């Protein structure tokens, strides 16, 4: 991009849903990416978020208050590119150039995925998924993450 | 509200002196050694 | 507002207070603990709600640039009051 | 004249001056770093990390920081190559993990499957 | 005529036309033990060749200093018996045969 | 362009009015009473010391001295926990552990500056993006052990509240240069 | 156990070792050695003073970052004994003196202060408490000092009936006040000793073996009541002592047979100074009381201390009291003390 | 700023230059008088170092530090002048040449201070070049060498002074050449305080110079360029470089990969 | 297999070197202790000087074999000259710390390490 | 500043120079502590227009080095050249030359 | 453009031209030779030619780089020689700078070009304390900048940054001691690195 704004008028703002106990919604800086989208369509296949409206006041989620709690459901988290759709218990506590990661393997599963650890000061901060195409793709499950 | 910043005055700042200086004063040779001699002769005397 | 644990030792604003039988109290043994008296989350719950017009309401700290990076805040919801991330004011709609 | 044969494997322990604890009881790991999940970048990969095992990392008490005991932590090493890794581990005498490179497998995309007339690949919104 | 050089240590050498001619036609002598095919041996006598010409044109010392352009012609004097100083070295060495071995591939590859 | 300090331009031959000078330079020590008279107007000038406790030295409104968390108007803490200040600091002098606050507010619950590892850059205030660290005008504040210049979140807090009438007014008049 | 005293981190001076420990007489000679293994091995150190600032000041090294917490105390205030014990699982005492002032005397110093210590320590609940008592202060001993020293083991044995008592020989060191003693007999004419320096009979022992044992009885899962004997690889004749003493000092070596009762007055003579006496009678009692052999009690060996023998760590402490002639001189050059057993 | 392959703007430049003939004049105060300290003379010491204090007060109005200023930046300059500093460089730099001279007439006509460096630590020019000295030795010696004539990088090649040279490579002739240094960095100075231009303090470049706060609390790209330089930094296109800078001491260079 | 020696073609003059080098520390030891106001004995500081060598006594490579005599060379130069002092000296005995024990009990007693 | 006449004079004298004139003490000449607020200029490419960052970007106009001769890529009468033009000789400097 | 530096190809193809001239006199020795777009001349030449190749810039009349600027080693531990040696050289006369590069690795020492600089006494001495490359023919190579009794060169990559040992006063030995290092803090280290590629430019081909 470049390294200057010639916007010179006001930013809209959209106001946040409670999707869940896991994933904190700030659809204020969603890009309408419909990302989540169509993973919750194919891949989680649930089907229960969407774009409502149009133009620049199209917004992501669900038109009503809907707990979208399934298995795979913090996928979102990681697949959303911008801080919209965060982990919640991973709230406000460490930052990607603090943690070091460890790859390791997950149990409480006999699937056997592929995790990164990141912890941080001798703590573990959140665990990520690793990228096995033989295991796991790209994504883990709600309890191991 | 127009640009301000610290600047230099319009005319320039003044002269500012940065060759050596020295003063080049005492008296001559001459007179230090004819008054030299002279208080050795009035006070042998 | 500072509470007094039933050690003795006062309870920071995030509260962290040495138990009874931990050994590390002796760095305050004939010295203190301090602790900041103004407890932010009092200080801002204490603030009143900004009664304004429009659906959308922009903050700063308070100056020009002074204050936090200049953020906007959807009033949609009539049950709760937008917060600023970055302050802790309050906004709420005159709907009337 | 100036060539000798020498059948050894090229041990300069004797020479790195570190403790014969940190090169008897000590594990590296030689692998490309896992790609960042939070992000769709792939430079971070590519290239071969050497890392040690994690020692203990307890709490201070006065403070409360994260105190050490080890000083080969914070020991990323970068390597253009595998071998060229295996080659530096076995050198300095430490005994080595290797794990092959991940590659994502190469998969087929179309955007006209999203509009399918009998397929399953049709989706219910754009 | 001229009184110093104005580096220290560089001593005034008077008929500096004289030194420079032996020293100029030693370095030749020396440079035709070269193999024809030393680029040393060119370059060089090439170098020799134009620096003796002009000190043969040139009487004047100052007028030859600013013709030679290599500072005072005292530290002309002092390159050119370096420069045959380097012709005896290099005559030791052989140093237009090829390279004696090459590098491993990634030897000089920036970055990693 | 250069210039000699020592080369001399031909001579002055020899005279004898010249050599008397000399002579009486070297026998009268003319350059040695010189010097005597220069440390003497010295001597008659007037001291530039200055009554150090009730006189302090001059200083900056960007001098940086002791560092300060600050608060809005409204009594909030500035600092938003974003660590940023921490991935500045060239001495790794800073330690920002935080989580969520009661009313879901994110801020800070350890924040330490190890005043005896920090190199008194100002790059953490510089960095910040709410004006949350600072580095007020405090300089005298040496302490008689090692620990007490290992700071916390209340320490930084409260000379943020010490402070904050000098701060404040710094900032007021340096924040247009920044 | 707590979550804090729990012995994570590798080795010392950066780890915790959970040994939160008082040390009462740390700002004396023996206190300095204990308080550097605790600091080394890391470890929170509770120092209670009385004197200077500046002279514990030798002691504000040897520990990282607060560990090493320095209180003032008073021996006539139980608030004071109380807030220095109320956050320890060990309390140690070194309190003692060579001689008797007139605020403290020997009764209060070896008797009053440890079962003031002890009982504070009893009631704060603290895991252990080791006491410094010395050997051969069994009973009717012939100096006061040891009498005391046995008359306080019983009361800190009737206060807190599990508490380690180690009973040490005459410790020697640096800055000791053994070794250094008799290299500065040679500031007098001669060597003043009773009966010439025989029949009697020592084993000093080293300080960093006795502060090692006390660091390891603070450690050690045995030693919850137990009486530990510190003494010396070798036992020696007082003569061969001495004449080895100032032989490694390369001074000279002439004795001088001298009677106890004026031996006794001499001591008073000298121990009668308003500051620290060089000698007293208690002190030349002591000089001539010999050491008992230690049978039944366990000692270094089972607390896990190597005795370091005197003629290896004797250099160390001698060579300050030489002249320039003989500074440059090894161990060699001194042939050692003939060794007794009896 | 070569590896970046970017400029500091203009102002940026001779801002540079100015407290670069500062610390020039800083440097040599400190040489003379220490080295006439370790002679035996330590009024003048006292003296210019009133005078370094006062040198010391406009880094502390500049920045933040008397000494480690960290302000002068790959992006140019950090932070601009206050308004009243050109004022005060020109009121202390008036009345500096008049210290020099108290100095000069001090030491350099003195017979002790003539005994005691004339003929002393004597380097021959060819043995300085060999020996790599580089940096004031050689203009004692005679070696007409400085680089700010011969490889200029800021606005040096547009500013006009002379290099002193010696002519017996003793240590009299490079206290005499660092007294005309500090001559010659006065002289620099009032060119430098008549020609300041009027421009912006960094490179206009958000990538790499931080951009202004207000900027920053404003704009969005503005703050994203704002954290990420002060999180992870530029990316320096991979490279080496050798840069050498005529430091007061002498030949300051930096290698950088 | 084809390497370019430094100073010693095979293992035999590496170890005359090495013989030389012991020879020259041996010797050096009781002027070190008497110079030097060292606590320790000649005994021990020639039984140390015997540590270290067995320690670097396990390599079979001439070209580290040489460069572990340039070292011990550089370091009996400076104890030969008084650069080193007590405290880098006494280095070598490690007499403050206490070292780790080989067995598994008390490994696993103390610490998380292999 | 605040001496007598006397004083002046035999400082003077002593000095061999005037030192009322230059005196290095500073009593009102300098600038006030509390200046007017600044307004400072903006730079270059704040132009809303016109001002693409690939055309100035200078961070990758950055090249490899480019590669004169190889022992690996190229596999390998004319006059004698130098790195550059030799130094032209420094002139003396006329406002003081000083020689 | 105000933003972006000007480039001198005049310079660049004199560097050129240079670079042909010293790689066709010197064909025994010289690996590589490029000219950087910063304009500056880099000459890589095989070990056994450091004598000769410095010699050749100390004293030829074309090429009088009499002035060794800088001598320094680069730590590159993935390619078989693992140091790079840089030696940076000026020209007084010509009014240049040129850089000439050779390879090692711990068991293969580099002469030393004491005979033909002397500032390579202390610049040697430094390479040798910090990477342990030796030199053959210096006269007292030892250490210069570490401890009196310190074991590795700590310059090297595998080195790490708080070194194996730290030193405090002890008491009981009344010493400066030395003890493995234990840090009350770890430094820690950030993982600055973008996902994203800066510069297509140096976009290496894949594997
Ligand atoms: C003396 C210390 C105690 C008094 C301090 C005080 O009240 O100072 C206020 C005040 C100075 O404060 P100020 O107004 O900042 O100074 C005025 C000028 O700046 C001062 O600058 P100045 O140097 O121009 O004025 C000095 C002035 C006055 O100096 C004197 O009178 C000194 C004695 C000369 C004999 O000298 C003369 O008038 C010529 C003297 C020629 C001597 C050859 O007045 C004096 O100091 C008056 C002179 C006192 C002389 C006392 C001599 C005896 C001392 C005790 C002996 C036992
Ligand atoms: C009222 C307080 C007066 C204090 C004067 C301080 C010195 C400053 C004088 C001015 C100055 O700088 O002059 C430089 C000037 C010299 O400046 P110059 O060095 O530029 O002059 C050189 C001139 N030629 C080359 C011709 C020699 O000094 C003189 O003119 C005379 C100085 C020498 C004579 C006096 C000193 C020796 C006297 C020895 C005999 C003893 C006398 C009685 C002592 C009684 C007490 C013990
Ligand atoms: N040292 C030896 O040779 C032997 C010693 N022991 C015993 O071991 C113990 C420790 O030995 P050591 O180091 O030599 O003793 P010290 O002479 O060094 O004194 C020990 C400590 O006792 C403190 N102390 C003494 N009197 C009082 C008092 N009235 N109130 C408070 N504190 C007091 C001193 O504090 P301050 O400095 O403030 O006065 C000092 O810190 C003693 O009990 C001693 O009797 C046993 C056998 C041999
Ligand atoms: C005061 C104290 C200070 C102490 C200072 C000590 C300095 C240490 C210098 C270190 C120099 C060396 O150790 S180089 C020696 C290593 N050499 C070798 O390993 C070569 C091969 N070695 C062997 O074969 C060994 O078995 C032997 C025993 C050395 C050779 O004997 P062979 O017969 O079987
Ligand atoms: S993945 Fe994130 S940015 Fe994309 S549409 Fe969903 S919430 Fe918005
Ligand atoms: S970090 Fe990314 S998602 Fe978060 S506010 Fe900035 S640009 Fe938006
Ligand atoms: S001033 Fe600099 S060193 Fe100190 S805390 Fe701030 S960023 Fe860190
Ligand atoms: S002080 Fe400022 S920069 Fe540091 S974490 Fe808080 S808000 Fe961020
Ligand atoms: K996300
Ligand atoms: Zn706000």
Known sequence: ?????????????????????????????????????????????????????????????????????????????????????????????????????????????????????????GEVMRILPRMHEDINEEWISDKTR | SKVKQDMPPPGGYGPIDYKRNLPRRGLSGYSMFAVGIGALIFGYW | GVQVSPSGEKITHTGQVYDEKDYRRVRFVDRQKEVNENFAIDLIAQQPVNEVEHRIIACDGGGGALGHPKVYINLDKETKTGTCGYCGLQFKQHHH | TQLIT?????????????????????????????????????????????????????????????????????????????????????????????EEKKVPKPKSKSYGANFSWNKRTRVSTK | ?????????????????????????????????????????????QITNEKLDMVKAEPDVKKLEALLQGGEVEEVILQAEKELSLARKMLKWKPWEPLVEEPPANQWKWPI | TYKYVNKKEQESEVDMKSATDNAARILMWTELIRGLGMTLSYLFREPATINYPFEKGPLSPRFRGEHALRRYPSGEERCIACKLCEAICPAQAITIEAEPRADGSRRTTRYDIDMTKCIYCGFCQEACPVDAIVEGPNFEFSTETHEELLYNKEKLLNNGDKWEAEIAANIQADYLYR | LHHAVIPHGKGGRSSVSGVVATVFGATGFLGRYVVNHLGRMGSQVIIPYRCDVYDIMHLRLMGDLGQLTFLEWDARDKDSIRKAVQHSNVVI????????????????????????????????GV????????????????????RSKAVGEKEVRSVFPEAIIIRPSDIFGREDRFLNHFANYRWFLAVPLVSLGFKTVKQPVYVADVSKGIVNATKDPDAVGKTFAFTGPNRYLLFHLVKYIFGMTHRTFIPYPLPLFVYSWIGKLFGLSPFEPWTTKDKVE??????????????????????????????????????????????????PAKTVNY | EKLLNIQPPPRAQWIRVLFGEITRILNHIMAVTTHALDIGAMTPFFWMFEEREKMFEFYERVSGARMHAAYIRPGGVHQDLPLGLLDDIYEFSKNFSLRIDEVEEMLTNNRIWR???????????????????????????????????????????????????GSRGDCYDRYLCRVEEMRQSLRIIEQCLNKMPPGEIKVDDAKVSPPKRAEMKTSMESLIHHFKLYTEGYQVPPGATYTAIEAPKGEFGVYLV | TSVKPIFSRDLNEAKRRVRELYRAWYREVPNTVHLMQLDITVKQGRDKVREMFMKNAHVTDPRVVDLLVIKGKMELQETIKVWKQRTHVMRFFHETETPRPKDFLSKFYMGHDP | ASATRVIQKLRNWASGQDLQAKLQLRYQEIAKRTQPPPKLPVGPSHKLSNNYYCTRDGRREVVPPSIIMSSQKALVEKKAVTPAPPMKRWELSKDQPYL | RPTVRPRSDVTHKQLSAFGEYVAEILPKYVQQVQVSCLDELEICIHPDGVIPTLTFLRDHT??????????????????????????????????????????????????????????????????????????????????????????????????????????????????????????????????????????????????
């Open chain 1, 1 to 121: 991009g470049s390294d200057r704004s010639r916007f010179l008028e006001g930013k809209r703002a959209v106001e946040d849903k409670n999707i869940g106990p896991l994933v904190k919604t700030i659809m204020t800086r969603c890009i309408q990416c419909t990302r989540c989208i169509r993973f919750a369509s194919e891949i989680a296949g649930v089907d229960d978020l969407g774009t409502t409206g149009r133009g620049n006041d199209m917004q992501v989620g669900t038109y009503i208050e809907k707990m979208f709690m399934s298995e795979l459901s913090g996928n979102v988290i990681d697949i959303c590119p911008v801080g919209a759709l965060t982990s919640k218990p991973y709230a406000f506590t460490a930052r990607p150039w603090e943690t070091r990661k460890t790859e390791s393997i997950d149990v409480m599963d006999a699937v056997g995925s592929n995790i990164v650890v990141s912890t941080r000061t």
């Open chain 4, 6 to 98: 020498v059948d050894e494997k090229l041990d300069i322990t004797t020479l790195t001056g570190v403790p014969e604890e940190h090169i008897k009881t000590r594990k590296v790991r030689i692998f490309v770093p896992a790609r960042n999940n939070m992000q769709s970048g792939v430079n971070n990969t590519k290239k071969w990390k050497m890392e040690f095992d994690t020692r203990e990392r307890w709490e201070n008490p006065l403070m409360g920081w994260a105190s050490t005991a080890d000083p080969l932590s914070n020991m990323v090493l970068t390597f253009s190559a595998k071998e060229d890794a295996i080659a530096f581990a076995e050198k300095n005498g430490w005994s080595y993990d290797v």
């Open chain 5, 1 to 45: 005529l001229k009184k110093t050089t104005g580096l220290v240590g560089l001593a005034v050498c008077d008929t500096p036309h004289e030194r420079l001619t032996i020293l100029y036609t030693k370095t030749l002598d020396i440079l035709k033990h070269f193999p024809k095919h030393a680029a040393y041996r060119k370059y060089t006598e």
């Open chain 7, 93 to 124: 005492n070194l309190i003692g003196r060579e001689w008797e002032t007139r605020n403290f005397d020997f009764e209060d110093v070896f008797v009053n202060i440890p079962r003031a210590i002890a009982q504070a320590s009893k009631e704060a």
């Open chain 7, 127 to 146: 895991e252990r408490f080791i006491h410094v008592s010395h050997l051969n202060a069994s009973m009717k001993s012939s100096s006061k000092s040891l």
């Open chain 7, 286 to 335: 002591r000089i001539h009381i010999s050491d008992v052999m230690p049978t039944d009690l366990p000692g270094l060996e089972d607390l896990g201390v190597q005795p370091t023998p005197l003629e290896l760590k004797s250099i160390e402490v001698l060579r300050r009291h030489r002249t320039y002639r003989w500074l440059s001189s090894e161990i060699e050059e001194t042939k």
């Open chain 8, 115 to 165: 005994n005691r460096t004339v003929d002393i630590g004597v380097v021959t020019a060819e043995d300085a070049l060999n020996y790599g000295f580089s940096g004031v030795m050689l203009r004692g010696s005679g070696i007409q060498w400085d680089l700010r004539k011969t490889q200029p990088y800021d606005v040096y090649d547009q500013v006009e002074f002379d290099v002193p040279i």
């Open chain 11, 62 to 207: 074309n090429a009088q780089f009499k002035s060794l600027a800088d001598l320094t080693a680069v730590d590159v531990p993935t390619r078989q020689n693992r140091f790079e040696i840089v030696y940076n050289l000026l020209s007084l006369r010509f009014n240049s700078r040129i850089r000439v590069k050779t390879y090692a690795d711990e068991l293969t020492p580099i002469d030393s070009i004491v005979s033909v600089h002397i500032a390579a006494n202390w610049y040697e001495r430094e390479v040798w304390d910090m990477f342990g490359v030796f030199f053959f023919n210096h006269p007292d190579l030892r250490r210069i900048l570490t401890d009196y009794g310190f074991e590795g060169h700590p310059f090297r990559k595998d080195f790490p940054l708080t070194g194996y040992v730290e030193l405090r006063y002890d008491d009981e030995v009344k010493r400066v001691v030395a003890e493995p290092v234990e840090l009350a803090q770890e430094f820690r280290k950030f993982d600055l690195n973008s996902p994203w590629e800066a510069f297509p430019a140096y976009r290496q081909p894949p594997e």
